[PDB]
Amino acid sequence: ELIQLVLKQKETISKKEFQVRELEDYIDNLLVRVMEETPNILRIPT
Amino acid sequence: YSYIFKYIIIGDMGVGKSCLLHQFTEKKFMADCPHTIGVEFGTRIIEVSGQKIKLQIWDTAGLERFRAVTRSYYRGAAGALMVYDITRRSTYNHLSSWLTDARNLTNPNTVIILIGNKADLEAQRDVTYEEAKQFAEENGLLFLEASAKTGENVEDAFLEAAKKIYQ
Ligand SMILES: Nc1nc2c(ncn2[C@@H]2O[C@H](COP(=O)(O)OP(=O)(O)OP(=O)(O)O)[C@@H](O)[C@H]2O)c(=O)[nH]1
Ligand SMILES: [Mg+2]
């Protein structure tokens, strides 16, 4: 038994949610610029 | 083509927004649509009152929360597909707040069409035709049920909107 990794796994999870929101913030800020300055980058397919 | 109409598609995660876009612009439900990261758009050229028009149709994940791309996403929109899942009331219950956002982030003559998607999933219906059609009229929306999967009413949804935006 060593039960404390629950607290530690919690810590870990919080850290990755921070990591995730960080990356979503980057993307968003990038996409603003891209949409203003070369929107065709975001076309599909090609 | 000699005019361009900007469309947005909006609605909760997993209603089929990406799959509608993809059914329209490649008549193919390839297939298990895997959730949208940031922002993309397709095009199709249509014809209205004998005039050729490029639809330019933007897709992103169901946000809700304000974000950096939000303003410019709505910004120039001539039409908006507002989409719910026919098998999930929650997605339908949220329509009114989607319409709110839509209405203050686009121009007032922006044409908005309500899509109840996944009409193929009859067995799992969680929302009536009639009550969705009611909401549509109360709110001066165009309304169709559709299926991105079968193709059913997908073309019609985009073209019905295009007429009301004009020749
Ligand atoms: N049976 C059926 N499945 C559908 C239909 N439209 C979409 N799907 C499926 O439902 C799931 C979600 O569809 P998406 O088009 O990704 O929904 P979305 O609204 O783009 O998702 P987000 O990008 O996260 O907002 C996927 O598994 C699709 O394959 C439909 O008309 N019928
Ligand atoms: Mg999507």
Tab-separated table of C-alpha atoms and ligand atoms in Angstrom:
chain	number	residue	atom	x	y	z
A	1	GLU	CA	0.000	0.000	0.000
A	2	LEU	CA	1.131	3.536	-0.881
A	3	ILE	CA	-2.055	5.555	-1.423
A	4	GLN	CA	-0.631	8.992	-2.013
A	5	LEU	CA	-0.193	8.633	-5.786
A	6	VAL	CA	-3.864	9.561	-6.034
A	7	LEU	CA	-2.864	13.089	-4.928
A	8	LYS	CA	0.131	12.794	-7.314
A	9	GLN	CA	-1.959	11.521	-10.233
A	10	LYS	CA	-4.330	14.399	-9.560
A	11	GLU	CA	-1.359	16.774	-9.731
A	12	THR	CA	-0.351	15.087	-12.995
A	13	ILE	CA	-3.770	15.456	-14.548
A	14	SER	CA	-3.970	19.148	-13.703
A	15	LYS	CA	-0.615	19.626	-15.356
A	16	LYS	CA	-1.750	18.033	-18.653
A	17	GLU	CA	-4.952	20.064	-18.716
A	18	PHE	CA	-2.698	23.077	-18.442
A	19	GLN	CA	-0.606	21.667	-21.280
A	20	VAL	CA	-3.729	21.102	-23.361
A	21	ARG	CA	-5.150	24.602	-22.861
A	22	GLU	CA	-1.724	26.077	-23.647
A	23	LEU	CA	-1.686	24.320	-26.988
A	24	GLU	CA	-5.287	25.362	-27.768
A	25	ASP	CA	-4.327	28.935	-26.985
A	26	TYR	CA	-1.351	28.794	-29.372
A	27	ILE	CA	-3.446	27.288	-32.157
A	28	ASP	CA	-6.144	29.912	-31.776
A	29	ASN	CA	-3.698	32.810	-31.855
A	30	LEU	CA	-1.982	31.341	-34.868
A	31	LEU	CA	-5.241	30.772	-36.696
A	32	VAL	CA	-6.339	34.375	-36.167
A	33	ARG	CA	-3.218	35.525	-37.993
A	34	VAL	CA	-3.535	32.900	-40.698
A	35	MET	CA	-7.174	33.761	-41.355
A	36	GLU	CA	-6.289	37.444	-41.804
A	37	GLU	CA	-3.112	37.017	-43.830
A	38	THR	CA	-3.452	33.789	-45.844
A	39	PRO	CA	-6.804	31.997	-45.256
A	40	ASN	CA	-6.298	29.606	-48.160
A	41	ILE	CA	-3.832	27.688	-45.930
A	42	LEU	CA	-6.983	26.358	-44.238
A	43	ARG	CA	-8.628	25.007	-47.402
A	44	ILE	CA	-9.393	21.331	-47.886
A	45	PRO	CA	-8.058	19.296	-49.635
A	46	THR	CA	-5.208	21.202	-51.043
B	1	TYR	CA	-17.253	32.372	-59.110
B	2	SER	CA	-18.500	35.944	-59.731
B	3	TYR	CA	-19.858	36.070	-56.180
B	4	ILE	CA	-18.680	34.361	-53.017
B	5	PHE	CA	-20.972	33.510	-50.117
B	6	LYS	CA	-19.297	32.807	-46.753
B	7	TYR	CA	-21.085	30.107	-44.721
B	8	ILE	CA	-20.412	29.053	-41.136
B	9	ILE	CA	-21.564	25.803	-39.554
B	10	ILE	CA	-22.275	25.911	-35.815
B	11	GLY	CA	-23.528	23.615	-33.025
B	12	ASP	CA	-22.431	21.262	-30.264
B	13	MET	CA	-19.657	18.742	-30.549
B	14	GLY	CA	-20.555	15.600	-32.464
B	15	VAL	CA	-23.768	16.765	-34.175
B	16	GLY	CA	-22.188	16.135	-37.577
B	17	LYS	CA	-20.961	19.621	-38.605
B	18	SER	CA	-17.820	18.386	-40.260
B	19	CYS	CA	-19.658	15.453	-41.846
B	20	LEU	CA	-22.285	17.780	-43.347
B	21	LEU	CA	-19.523	19.930	-44.869
B	22	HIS	CA	-17.872	16.800	-46.199
B	23	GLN	CA	-21.063	15.263	-47.597
B	24	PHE	CA	-21.791	18.512	-49.425
B	25	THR	CA	-18.406	19.132	-50.950
B	26	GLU	CA	-17.369	15.577	-51.774
B	27	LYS	CA	-20.717	13.695	-51.777
B	28	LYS	CA	-19.036	11.130	-49.506
B	29	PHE	CA	-19.459	10.229	-45.831
B	30	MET	CA	-15.843	9.363	-45.172
B	31	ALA	CA	-16.907	8.699	-42.421
B	32	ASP	CA	-16.373	8.444	-38.700
B	33	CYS	CA	-15.641	12.232	-38.610
B	34	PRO	CA	-12.808	12.629	-36.013
B	35	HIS	CA	-13.457	15.984	-34.213
B	36	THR	CA	-12.213	19.254	-35.447
B	37	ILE	CA	-9.025	20.965	-34.410
B	38	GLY	CA	-8.847	24.516	-35.197
B	39	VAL	CA	-10.416	25.924	-38.311
B	40	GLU	CA	-10.867	24.854	-41.936
B	41	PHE	CA	-13.143	25.491	-44.917
B	42	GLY	CA	-14.445	23.796	-48.024
B	43	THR	CA	-15.823	25.285	-51.256
B	44	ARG	CA	-18.513	24.366	-53.725
B	45	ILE	CA	-19.792	26.244	-56.773
B	46	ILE	CA	-23.568	26.328	-57.074
B	47	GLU	CA	-26.063	28.125	-59.348
B	48	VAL	CA	-28.861	30.421	-58.179
B	49	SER	CA	-31.310	32.380	-60.320
B	50	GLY	CA	-29.055	31.322	-63.220
B	51	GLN	CA	-25.912	32.825	-61.629
B	52	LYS	CA	-22.824	30.939	-60.534
B	53	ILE	CA	-21.826	31.328	-56.844
B	54	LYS	CA	-18.937	29.995	-54.782
B	55	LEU	CA	-19.943	28.818	-51.328
B	56	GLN	CA	-17.071	29.052	-48.898
B	57	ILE	CA	-17.948	27.033	-45.859
B	58	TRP	CA	-16.075	27.253	-42.568
B	59	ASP	CA	-15.813	24.582	-39.921
B	60	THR	CA	-14.365	24.473	-36.377
B	61	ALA	CA	-15.051	22.655	-33.079
B	62	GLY	CA	-18.096	23.645	-30.958
B	63	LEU	CA	-16.251	26.242	-28.929
B	64	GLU	CA	-19.095	28.056	-27.228
B	65	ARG	CA	-16.467	29.829	-25.083
B	66	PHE	CA	-15.034	32.999	-26.610
B	67	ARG	CA	-11.679	32.585	-28.215
B	68	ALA	CA	-9.193	34.429	-30.354
B	69	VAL	CA	-10.547	33.035	-33.659
B	70	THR	CA	-14.168	33.555	-32.654
B	71	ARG	CA	-14.798	37.026	-34.077
B	72	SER	CA	-13.152	36.379	-37.413
B	73	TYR	CA	-14.988	33.014	-37.694
B	74	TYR	CA	-18.441	34.611	-37.646
B	75	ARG	CA	-17.210	37.835	-39.221
B	76	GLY	CA	-18.195	37.869	-42.906
B	77	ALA	CA	-20.873	35.194	-42.813
B	78	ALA	CA	-23.746	35.371	-45.323
B	79	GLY	CA	-25.268	32.065	-44.171
B	80	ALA	CA	-25.068	29.917	-41.027
B	81	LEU	CA	-25.980	26.252	-40.641
B	82	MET	CA	-27.096	25.846	-37.023
B	83	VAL	CA	-26.889	22.115	-36.390
B	84	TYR	CA	-28.255	19.754	-33.683
B	85	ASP	CA	-28.310	15.966	-33.209
B	86	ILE	CA	-31.754	14.394	-33.634
B	87	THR	CA	-30.695	11.590	-31.271
B	88	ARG	CA	-29.604	14.005	-28.472
B	89	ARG	CA	-31.964	16.587	-26.930
B	90	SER	CA	-29.048	18.309	-25.179
B	91	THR	CA	-27.664	19.470	-28.546
B	92	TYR	CA	-31.151	20.716	-29.390
B	93	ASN	CA	-31.683	22.326	-25.961
B	94	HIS	CA	-28.587	24.460	-26.580
B	95	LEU	CA	-29.830	25.861	-29.924
B	96	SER	CA	-31.123	29.101	-28.400
B	97	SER	CA	-27.710	30.205	-27.130
B	98	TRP	CA	-26.008	29.324	-30.442
B	99	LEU	CA	-28.562	31.575	-32.144
B	100	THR	CA	-27.827	34.344	-29.649
B	101	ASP	CA	-24.090	34.236	-30.359
B	102	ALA	CA	-24.777	33.968	-34.061
B	103	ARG	CA	-27.087	36.980	-34.039
B	104	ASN	CA	-24.663	39.411	-32.341
B	105	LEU	CA	-21.515	38.204	-34.158
B	106	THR	CA	-22.924	38.300	-37.708
B	107	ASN	CA	-24.892	40.878	-39.706
B	108	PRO	CA	-28.685	40.983	-39.120
B	109	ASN	CA	-29.599	39.835	-42.673
B	110	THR	CA	-27.428	36.756	-42.146
B	111	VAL	CA	-29.502	33.823	-43.234
B	112	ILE	CA	-29.697	31.078	-40.637
B	113	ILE	CA	-30.885	27.538	-41.354
B	114	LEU	CA	-31.547	24.982	-38.591
B	115	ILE	CA	-30.334	21.438	-39.363
B	116	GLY	CA	-31.499	18.460	-37.335
B	117	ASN	CA	-28.872	16.003	-38.492
B	118	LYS	CA	-28.594	12.174	-38.298
B	119	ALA	CA	-32.104	11.657	-39.674
B	120	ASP	CA	-30.981	8.160	-40.722
B	121	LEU	CA	-30.909	7.282	-36.992
B	122	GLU	CA	-34.684	7.075	-36.729
B	123	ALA	CA	-34.609	4.330	-34.103
B	124	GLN	CA	-32.776	6.704	-31.741
B	125	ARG	CA	-34.912	9.804	-32.341
B	126	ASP	CA	-34.832	12.017	-29.246
B	127	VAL	CA	-36.327	15.188	-30.768
B	128	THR	CA	-39.557	15.594	-32.732
B	129	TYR	CA	-39.777	17.118	-36.165
B	130	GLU	CA	-42.603	19.316	-35.053
B	131	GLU	CA	-41.022	20.942	-32.033
B	132	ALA	CA	-37.848	21.749	-33.957
B	133	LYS	CA	-39.938	23.112	-36.874
B	134	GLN	CA	-41.848	25.146	-34.289
B	135	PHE	CA	-38.673	26.651	-32.857
B	136	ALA	CA	-37.496	27.415	-36.414
B	137	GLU	CA	-40.592	29.472	-37.237
B	138	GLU	CA	-40.891	31.301	-33.936
B	139	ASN	CA	-37.278	32.326	-34.570
B	140	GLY	CA	-37.614	32.988	-38.333
B	141	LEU	CA	-35.246	30.148	-39.256
B	142	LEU	CA	-35.275	27.820	-42.249
B	143	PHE	CA	-35.479	24.203	-41.204
B	144	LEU	CA	-34.613	20.730	-42.519
B	145	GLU	CA	-33.825	17.326	-41.102
B	146	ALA	CA	-30.805	15.831	-42.829
B	147	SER	CA	-28.255	13.014	-42.829
B	148	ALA	CA	-24.632	13.661	-43.631
B	149	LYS	CA	-24.335	9.906	-43.927
B	150	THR	CA	-26.923	9.174	-46.648
B	151	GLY	CA	-26.770	12.610	-48.291
B	152	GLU	CA	-30.368	13.174	-47.380
B	153	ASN	CA	-31.305	16.889	-47.697
B	154	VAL	CA	-27.689	17.952	-47.390
B	155	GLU	CA	-27.577	19.673	-50.828
B	156	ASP	CA	-31.005	21.125	-50.162
B	157	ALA	CA	-29.900	22.736	-46.903
B	158	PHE	CA	-27.081	24.688	-48.517
B	159	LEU	CA	-29.099	25.701	-51.618
B	160	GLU	CA	-32.250	26.796	-49.736
B	161	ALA	CA	-30.056	29.165	-47.740
B	162	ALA	CA	-28.312	30.469	-50.882
B	163	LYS	CA	-31.618	31.482	-52.493
B	164	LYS	CA	-32.583	33.596	-49.474
B	165	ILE	CA	-29.194	35.350	-49.634
B	166	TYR	CA	-30.067	36.162	-53.258
B	167	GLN	CA	-29.436	35.962	-57.033
C	1	LIG	N1	-25.284	7.982	-38.423
C	1	LIG	C1	-24.844	9.238	-38.672
C	1	LIG	N2	-23.660	9.586	-38.111
C	1	LIG	C2	-23.153	10.810	-38.301
C	1	LIG	C3	-23.894	11.775	-39.128
C	1	LIG	N3	-23.159	12.900	-39.137
C	1	LIG	C4	-22.044	12.671	-38.390
C	1	LIG	N4	-22.044	11.411	-37.902
C	1	LIG	C5	-21.047	10.786	-37.017
C	1	LIG	O1	-21.168	11.433	-35.750
C	1	LIG	C6	-19.881	11.712	-35.208
C	1	LIG	C7	-19.669	13.218	-35.120
C	1	LIG	O2	-19.752	13.836	-36.407
C	1	LIG	P1	-18.909	15.160	-36.744
C	1	LIG	O3	-19.252	15.613	-38.138
C	1	LIG	O4	-17.464	14.964	-36.343
C	1	LIG	O5	-19.541	16.181	-35.691
C	1	LIG	P2	-18.852	17.578	-35.373
C	1	LIG	O6	-20.043	18.410	-34.939
C	1	LIG	O7	-18.023	18.025	-36.549
C	1	LIG	O8	-17.792	17.394	-34.130
C	1	LIG	P3	-16.851	18.632	-33.540
C	1	LIG	O9	-15.870	18.967	-34.646
C	1	LIG	O10	-16.100	18.108	-32.362
C	1	LIG	O11	-17.776	19.771	-33.173
C	1	LIG	C8	-18.901	11.045	-36.127
C	1	LIG	O12	-18.673	9.726	-35.646
C	1	LIG	C9	-19.618	10.962	-37.445
C	1	LIG	O13	-19.173	9.858	-38.228
C	1	LIG	C10	-25.184	11.328	-39.707
C	1	LIG	O14	-25.880	12.092	-40.413
C	1	LIG	N5	-25.584	10.076	-39.439
C	2	MG	MG	-16.309	18.829	-36.591
